[PDB]
Write an enzyme that holds these catalytic residues in place. Sequence first.
Site, PDB file in Angstrom:
ATOM      1  N   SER A 120     -86.472  14.187 100.242  1.00  0.00           N
ATOM      2  CA  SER A 120     -87.434  15.301 100.144  1.00  0.00           C
ATOM      3  C   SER A 120     -88.515  15.034  99.080  1.00  0.00           C
ATOM      4  O   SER A 120     -89.242  14.058  99.198  1.00  0.00           O
ATOM      5  CB  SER A 120     -86.720  16.644  99.953  1.00  0.00           C
ATOM      6  OG  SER A 120     -87.612  17.744 100.146  1.00  0.00           O
ATOM      7  N   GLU A 127     -84.098  19.438 110.188  1.00  0.00           N
ATOM      8  CA  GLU A 127     -84.800  19.581 108.926  1.00  0.00           C
ATOM      9  C   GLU A 127     -85.109  21.038 108.531  1.00  0.00           C
ATOM     10  O   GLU A 127     -85.031  21.401 107.355  1.00  0.00           O
ATOM     11  CB  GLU A 127     -86.073  18.740 108.917  1.00  0.00           C
ATOM     12  CG  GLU A 127     -85.843  17.247 109.075  1.00  0.00           C
ATOM     13  CD  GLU A 127     -85.367  16.557 107.801  1.00  0.00           C
ATOM     14  OE1 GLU A 127     -85.315  17.198 106.725  1.00  0.00           O
ATOM     15  OE2 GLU A 127     -85.041  15.351 107.878  1.00  0.00           O
ATOM     16  N   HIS A 170     -81.284  19.520 106.379  1.00  0.00           N
ATOM     17  CA  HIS A 170     -82.008  18.851 105.308  1.00  0.00           C
ATOM     18  C   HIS A 170     -81.148  18.684 104.049  1.00  0.00           C
ATOM     19  O   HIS A 170     -80.660  19.669 103.490  1.00  0.00           O
ATOM     20  CB  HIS A 170     -83.267  19.680 105.025  1.00  0.00           C
ATOM     21  CG  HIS A 170     -84.112  19.160 103.915  1.00  0.00           C
ATOM     22  ND1 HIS A 170     -85.042  18.160 104.098  1.00  0.00           N
ATOM     23  CD2 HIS A 170     -84.186  19.515 102.609  1.00  0.00           C
ATOM     24  CE1 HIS A 170     -85.642  17.909 102.945  1.00  0.00           C
ATOM     25  NE2 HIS A 170     -85.142  18.718 102.025  1.00  0.00           N
TER      26      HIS A 170
END
EC number: 3.1.1.7
Lengths: 535, 530
Positions: A203, A327, A440
Amino acid sequence: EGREDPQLLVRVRGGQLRGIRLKAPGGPVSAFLGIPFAEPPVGSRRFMPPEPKRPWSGVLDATTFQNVCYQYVDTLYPGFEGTEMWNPNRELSEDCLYLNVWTPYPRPASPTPVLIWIYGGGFYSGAASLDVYDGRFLAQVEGAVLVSMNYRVGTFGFLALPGSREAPGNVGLLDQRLALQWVQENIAAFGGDPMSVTLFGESAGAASVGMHILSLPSRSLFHRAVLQSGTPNGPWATVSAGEARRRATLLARLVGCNDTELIACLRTRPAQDLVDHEWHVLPQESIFRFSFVPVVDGDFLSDTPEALINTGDFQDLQVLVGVVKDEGSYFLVYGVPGFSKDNESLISRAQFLAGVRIGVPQASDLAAEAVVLHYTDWLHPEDPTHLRDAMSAVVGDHNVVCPVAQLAGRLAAQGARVYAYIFEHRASTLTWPLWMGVPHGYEIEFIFGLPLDPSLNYTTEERIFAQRLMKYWTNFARTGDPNDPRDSKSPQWPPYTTAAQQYVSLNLKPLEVRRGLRAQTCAFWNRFLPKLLSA
Amino acid sequence: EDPQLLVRVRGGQLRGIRLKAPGGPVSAFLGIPFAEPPVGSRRFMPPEPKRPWSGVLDATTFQNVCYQYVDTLYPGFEGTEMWNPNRELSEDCLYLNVWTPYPRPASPTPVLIWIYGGGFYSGAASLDVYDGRFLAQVEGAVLVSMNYRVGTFGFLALPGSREAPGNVGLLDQRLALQWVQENIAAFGGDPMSVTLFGESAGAASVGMHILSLPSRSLFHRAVLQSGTPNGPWATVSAGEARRRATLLARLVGCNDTELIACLRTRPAQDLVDHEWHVLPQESIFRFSFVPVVDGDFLSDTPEALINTGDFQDLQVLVGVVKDEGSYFLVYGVPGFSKDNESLISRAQFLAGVRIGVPQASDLAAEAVVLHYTDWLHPEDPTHLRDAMSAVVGDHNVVCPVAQLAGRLAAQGARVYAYIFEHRASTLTWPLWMGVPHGYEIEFIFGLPLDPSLNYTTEERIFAQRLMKYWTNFARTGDPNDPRDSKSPQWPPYTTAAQQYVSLNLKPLEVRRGLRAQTCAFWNRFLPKLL
Ligand SMILES: *[C@@H]1O[C@H](CO)[C@@H](O)[C@H](O)[C@H]1NC(C)=O
């Protein structure tokens, strides 16, 4: 010294360190934790670039993680493993610039390749001390030298009055850079090869890795890079200089404050005080309403990442990039009405159009219409189970998958060796609901080899899969190629090319090649949607 | 004097001819006048009922074709000639034909009335592919087809004027319907079971009779194959028709009355020369003279009209073929020809879209391009060639057909929908055109039942099937065989389920959603964008 374990005393440019022999599943590892790499960014030093750590005397104890940089603590779900696992796990303090090193035990004969971890947390949170970033398994099982640093997040890390002496911007990235410098000079003392340094992150950490690829002074400090579920390009990783200026001024007002005079005031505000307001700068309903991220300052970032990935020469670059199955799902629970961890989160069409406005806050009325239209299953435009999954994809595709497909695209085409994956395995131990899929962040515990700890209740095949993943990553750090030079009976991982757009699935089954990374849809976000703003 | 071939209609007596069909004889009545020849001062004007006649009027041969552009793109090529006029061209053309079973029906037979396509600039009832002999012999149907005025003669309007009020080609059609109410019984037809069917412009015309109140009491059901009243090509606005008219008049050198009087004085062939010069505009559907939204025949745009209409007591069969757009590409679209495989470059494709969607702004072109591109094989000439076909097919036929089927269903009509996927073994265009616009008609009409035509024995059965579907729908409003369990059944098209069937050689397959995602793009997105 005298009695101390001799394998645990190392000297670095700043002085002497005493490390700790940690127990790992298949044997022991060395850890030197909480090594300082910069003068504490406190007091007058707040908002300012980091200065190198002035040498200390005697033997520094490096057997525990240090303070975690001052950040907002998540309180959405008290007690909840699935959110607490990301919460700071040492004292919060502005004196937070330390880094950690895991090496084999004994420290290796010949010089081993180094892997550096840059954690994520949307630029507003994170720590290298969190459990899912424990370097012991990679150290032990792959003979790797692993390093992770703390870098400043939120206002301390990214509040910028661009062009000013006192708050130049990007200082969080500059903390990261100083740590890479520290690695070059000092890692050899632990048997590290300063000529084989791979960056990896996830990320905002992956975006960080991307920005080091794009920032010339940082280019000379590493050789390979791995970007997991993030990119320096895209809607959330950067800010225009002017916007960054707007946001910093607004925060200044909120806490009660010629740039010098302004920042001087800010600097006299308590840390927590700033943290209490960092969210108020964009009342603007937006998941990715994080206000202090890397600024395109014409210095660290000479130009927008988008520009720089379309005009750069990446001849000499090997990159591993990928995304997870779901995600967006994780993000929905954080302020998209209708979504919760505690039910199936089936939403209505009304809640879908409403979530699209929030998920894509930069979108005009016509664009929101475009998005809604592209994601509607016209066979069942009213089906809550589908709309729920749609909302996930919109947020996921807009913020991660398409920026990554774009990044892979431009880089491959512009001379890079790119390897692309999609992570498909949900943890047997995952504490989020079934509807969230493979969310995610939940590849990290596998790359780091957590399932190897018997006390963690992972299935056997998960323990095998973890090993397999660690092999890919470290092989990549080693050679620029995730594949095994010897064993080639098990299927090959081909580079991603403009020609073939090939990537592989990562899950409990052997490798499978697929073609096209959300090809049609990413064409929507990357090619069409922009032009629907040249209007 | 075969008394079976002799009928008294309101205008007088007619003598038919006994035509021969595969498994029996049929009674033809070809070239019956339904109107006074719309010639001289009558050009551009509503049709009037034909005056009665003395004696026995010979009705054993097809009459003149309405005055039209003759297609010369591929001379002597059967693929194109088959659509070309097969009788003398003449402004005197308002004639219809009736086929009936021989001996002529003991009790009242449902009537089918055919309306030819040709984009409102061409076509004839007399073409080989609209031969009504098989449908009459094999299914015992009374089948009617009529000529209607096309091009400037049929559709040139100076809206609001008295002497060229527009839509006269549609009024011709109506009068044939009126004629059928009044006369078809005398042939064994049932005026209480009139079903209209037509392809392309014929489909749109059918649809316009659905949308026009005076037409409604003249039929009971409708079939719209590969065309619609809505969509980009089928209609024009008062303003635009008037502009196209005055521009035609200027191109032949010519106050409303004075403008028309001058046009009226001009040889027919003169107007056909400058017919295609009113929209120089490099597109395909640059045919200038089509039905006009006039506040009269069409009270409001078809879109407005299908959106608010109450279609409660109405059954409709609608459908498309597998490759609508392939045909139209060979007409003025760079890179496309019946002679090579037509594999095209990406650059060709982008200009091809500016041509196929000539309404499109810079942006909407880009949207269309980006939507229709196969982003995995963005450069493959096969995909760009097939894509161009799709864009043109979808925009003009498929999506309009999806849209109407949705609206009629939503507002209470009973809708059956199909996709036709069988390429005729005897087809003469190249393989890359697939199953092109037009090539279903020959099967519906029963042509393969004629052994002299060398259709495969499979194709001959497929025909009987389609002929049953159509006539069954004509009889009942339901294409399904009322004595066929173990079908499987053809479900009505509803907005919820969205079911159509695939018409091809394999027994029926039910599929759901007629190009659902793509037509959402055409029917919901582009409008907003413009
Ligand atoms: C699930 O929980 C959320 C948040 O409390 C609530 O708003 C939503 O309506 C619930 N979903 C349903 C309809 O079960």
